[PDB]
Design a protein around this ligand. Structure first.
Ligand SMILES: *[C@@H]1O[C@H](CO)[C@@H](O[C@@H]2O[C@H](CO)[C@@H](O[C@@H]3O[C@H](CO)[C@@H](O)[C@H](O)[C@@H]3O)[C@H](O)[C@H]2NC(C)=O)[C@H](O)[C@H]1NC(C)=O
Ligand SMILES: *[C@@H]1O[C@H](CO)[C@@H](O[C@@H]2O[C@H](CO)[C@@H](O)[C@H](O)[C@H]2NC(C)=O)[C@H](O)[C@H]1NC(C)=O
Lengths: 35, 50
């Protein structure tokens, strides 16, 4: 239960839905860096 | 086998609870650093021709 007094860490904490288990910001970094 | 990253625990977070220590320990740790290496010299002429 994520009740941190109003602060919201969803964009930096891991995403259970995705199979990679990577946060929303980390996924854009991995997509953005392609050979 | 597959690597294990460490023991797993879950700190008991709550919005009106705190944890405070009641004792202490004093620890001594070691750290090692190299500062120099051997001073060597080579005379090219004697090495190559001789
Ligand atoms: C904070 O931690 C220290 C240890 O880091 C505690 O001191 C330790 O206290 C125990 C029990 O009083 C000592 O063990 C006993 O020692 C007697 C010798 O007097 C021996 O006959 C017993 O069989 C038993 O082994 C222990 O030696 C002692 N440690 C040191 C380094 O003196 C201290 O009590 C802790 N403080 C609090 C408030 O909990
Ligand atoms: C933390 O912020 C995120 C991002 O705004 C919130 O996620 C949104 O939640 C609303 C309501 O559930 C949805 O309509 C949005 O589509 C969500 N946005 C995204 C990008 O997923 C999240 O709800 C916030 N956390 C809390 C506890 O309110």
């Amino acid at each position: 239960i994520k009740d941190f007094g109003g602060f919201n860490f969803s964009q930096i904490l891991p995403d259970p839905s995705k199979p990679s288990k990577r946060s929303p910001i980390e996924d854009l970094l991995f997509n953005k860096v392609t050979l | 086998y597959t690597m294990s990253l460490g023991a797993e625990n879950s700190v008991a977070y709550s919005n009106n609870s705190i944890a405070i220590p009641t004792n202490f320990t004093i620890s001594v740790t070691t750290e090692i650093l190299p500062v120099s290496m051997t001073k060597t010299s080579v005379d090219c002429t004697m090495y190559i021709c001789g």
